[PDB]
Design an enzyme around this catalytic site. Sequence first.
Site, PDB file in Angstrom:
ATOM      1  N   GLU A  82       4.832  -3.325  -8.390  1.00 23.12           N
ATOM      2  CA  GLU A  82       3.936  -3.237  -9.539  1.00 23.12           C
ATOM      3  C   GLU A  82       3.528  -4.614 -10.053  1.00 23.12           C
ATOM      4  OE1 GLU A  82       2.275  -1.199 -11.659  1.00 23.12           O
ATOM      5  OE2 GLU A  82       2.386   0.042  -9.850  1.00 23.12           O
TER       6      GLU A  82
ATOM      7  N   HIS B 169      -5.633  -4.507  -9.075  1.00 28.13           N
ATOM      8  CA  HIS B 169      -4.240  -4.062  -9.041  1.00 28.13           C
ATOM      9  C   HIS B 169      -4.040  -2.996  -7.961  1.00 28.13           C
ATOM     10  CE1 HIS B 169      -0.436  -2.448 -11.049  1.00 28.13           C
ATOM     11  NE2 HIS B 169      -0.834  -1.421 -10.315  1.00 28.13           N
ATOM     12  N   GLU B 170      -4.906  -1.981  -7.946  1.00 23.57           N
ATOM     13  CA  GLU B 170      -4.711  -0.877  -7.010  1.00 23.57           C
ATOM     14  C   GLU B 170      -4.988  -1.306  -5.578  1.00 23.57           C
ATOM     15  OE1 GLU B 170      -3.273   1.937  -7.560  1.00 23.57           O
ATOM     16  OE2 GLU B 170      -3.019   1.565  -9.671  1.00 23.57           O
TER      17      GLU B 170
ATOM     18  N   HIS C 182      -2.055  -2.908  -4.024  1.00 28.07           N
ATOM     19  CA  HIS C 182      -1.040  -2.028  -3.432  1.00 28.07           C
ATOM     20  C   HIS C 182      -1.283  -1.843  -1.933  1.00 28.07           C
ATOM     21  CE1 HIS C 182       1.397  -0.974  -6.824  1.00 28.07           C
ATOM     22  NE2 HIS C 182       0.411  -0.409  -7.497  1.00 28.07           N
TER      23      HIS C 182
ATOM     24  N   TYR D 114       8.369   2.023  -3.586  1.00 30.18           N
ATOM     25  CA  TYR D 114       7.958   2.256  -4.965  1.00 30.18           C
ATOM     26  C   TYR D 114       9.075   2.869  -5.817  1.00 30.18           C
ATOM     27  CZ  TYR D 114       3.058   1.660  -3.251  1.00 30.18           C
ATOM     28  OH  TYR D 114       1.886   1.172  -2.725  1.00 30.18           O
TER      29      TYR D 114
ATOM     30  N   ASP E  35      10.084   7.045 -14.526  1.00 30.55           N
ATOM     31  CA  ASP E  35       9.113   6.103 -13.968  1.00 30.55           C
ATOM     32  C   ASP E  35       9.624   5.517 -12.655  1.00 30.55           C
ATOM     33  OD1 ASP E  35       6.722   4.657 -13.934  1.00 30.55           O
ATOM     34  OD2 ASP E  35       7.624   2.965 -15.002  1.00 30.55           O
TER      35      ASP E  35
ATOM     36  N   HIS F  38       7.025   0.521 -13.759  1.00 27.89           N
ATOM     37  CA  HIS F  38       6.031  -0.065 -14.661  1.00 27.89           C
ATOM     38  C   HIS F  38       6.659  -0.723 -15.885  1.00 27.89           C
ATOM     39  CE1 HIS F  38       3.389   2.901 -12.547  1.00 27.89           C
ATOM     40  NE2 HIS F  38       2.562   1.873 -12.581  1.00 27.89           N
TER      41      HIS F  38
HETATM   42 ZN   LIG Z   1       4.816   4.190 -14.458  1.00 25.80          ZN
HETATM   43 ZN   LIG Z   2       5.487  -0.498 -20.951  1.00 27.30          ZN
HETATM   44 ZN   LIG Z   3       0.455  -0.083  -9.490  1.00 27.93          ZN
HETATM   45 ZN   LIG Z   4      -1.581   2.606 -10.046  1.00 27.81          ZN
HETATM   46 ZN   LIG Z   5       1.066   2.596 -11.454  1.00 26.76          ZN
END
Ligand SMILES: [Zn+2]
Ligand SMILES: [Zn+2]
Ligand SMILES: [Zn+2]
Ligand SMILES: [Zn+2]
Ligand SMILES: [Zn+2]
Length: 316
Positions: free
Chosen positions: A166, A142-143, A146, A157, A226, A231
């Site tokens: 995300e 996942h990272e 990015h 973002y 957020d 997310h």
């Molecule tokens: Zn978040």
């Molecule tokens: Zn959630």
């Molecule tokens: Zn992420």
């Molecule tokens: Zn992250």
């Molecule tokens: Zn994140």
Amino acid sequence: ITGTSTVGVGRGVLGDQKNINTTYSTYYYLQDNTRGNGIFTYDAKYRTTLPGSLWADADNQFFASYDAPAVDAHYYAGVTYDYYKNVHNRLSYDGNNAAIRSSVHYSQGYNNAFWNGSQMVYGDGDGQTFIPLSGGIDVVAHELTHAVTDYTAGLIYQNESGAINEAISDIFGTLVEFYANKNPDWEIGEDVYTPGISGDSLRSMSDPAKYGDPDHYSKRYTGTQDNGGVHINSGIINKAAYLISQGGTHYGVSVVGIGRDKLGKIFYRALTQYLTPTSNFSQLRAAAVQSATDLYGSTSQEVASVKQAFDAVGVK
Ligand SMILES: [Zn+2]
Ligand SMILES: [Zn+2]
Ligand SMILES: [Zn+2]
Ligand SMILES: [Zn+2]
Ligand SMILES: [Zn+2]
Ligand SMILES: O[C@@H]1[C@@H](O)[C@H](O)OC[C@H]1O
Ligand SMILES: O[C@@H]1[C@@H](O)[C@H](O)OC[C@H]1O
Ligand SMILES: O[C@@H]1[C@@H](O)[C@H](O)OC[C@H]1O
Ligand SMILES: O[C@@H]1[C@@H](O)[C@H](O)OC[C@H]1O
Ligand SMILES: O[C@@H]1[C@@H](O)[C@H](O)OC[C@H]1O
Ligand SMILES: [Ca+2]
Ligand SMILES: [Ca+2]
Ligand SMILES: [Ca+2]
Ligand SMILES: [Cl-]
Ligand SMILES: [Cl-]
Ligand SMILES: [Cl-]
Ligand SMILES: [Cl-]
Ligand SMILES: [Zn+2]
Ligand SMILES: [Zn+2]
Ligand SMILES: [Zn+2]
């Protein structure tokens, strides 16, 4: 460093044994010369100074508890490199074989992992909410995804673009987990989250509502927390991706599943060819439809399934 390429052995965060590529020069270093311009893993020694010291080991055996997060950061960076190269013909995150650098033991009790623009950084967790975050292959991938997004579409973002950012990372994190055949599922972070609690995760792609995340555009979060719900609102796109691959009936719309390989090809092409920094959910749908058209034809089942999936989550 300069030395001989060797193969060591160690155990990861979850206790599994695995071989890792090292470099020998007096010590054995976590330096993998077999992938691009290299994969390098560092010890941050519980500081926040980066990258720290290149990981050195006296005997090429990594079975100490302190070693475990470094073993997995190093190994799963390699798996992620192999996925992008073998499946998408992409050489590292920038497409030009940039070295992948990771630091482990960052800070103390740190419940997070992140790509910082030039390297991966892993906390050890606090032992209750998380165990060391490099133990989750979907977190690692996942990272690192990015970084792929930053070097291609440049999605910002926040708000809908940030939720797409995300979700792209969750989609490829999961496809790398399947590619590695490492206890695969459509959950995110299940291997390192709440060690005391079986069967949970940070979020679900197959059923985002299990944790209160939206599974339909009508239920999207519209507040300011957020970064505008990046997310949270990712659940809408994650559910669509799950439906494209596996099929199902969702809010009364039936989706014919086309499998994981075609899901990955469609979204990779959308990300690299068609998305822009401020793409919204509607533009993602158009990009995915066009990508499926490019690859399989305008009258294909693949195009129809992409349309069905976005209809099912209310994205027109
Ligand atoms: Zn978040
Ligand atoms: Zn959630
Ligand atoms: Zn992420
Ligand atoms: Zn992250
Ligand atoms: Zn994140
Ligand atoms: O399982 C998937 C595999 O079938 C495909 O070939 O590449 C991506 C993997 O996630
Ligand atoms: O059917 C499965 C579903 O029940 C689970 O939640 O995620 C994987 C799916 O394939
Ligand atoms: O029913 C779900 C509930 O169990 C959870 O606590 O919050 C979200 C809802 O979708
Ligand atoms: O407020 C934003 C909302 O307007 C959009 O639809 O989805 C993302 C949110 O942050
Ligand atoms: O599926 C529902 C749809 O039919 C309605 O139009 O908007 C809200 C959705 O939950
Ligand atoms: Ca050792
Ligand atoms: Ca997972
Ligand atoms: Ca758990
Ligand atoms: Cl479901
Ligand atoms: Cl559902
Ligand atoms: Cl379903
Ligand atoms: Cl449903
Ligand atoms: Zn898993
Ligand atoms: Zn549903
Ligand atoms: Zn469903």
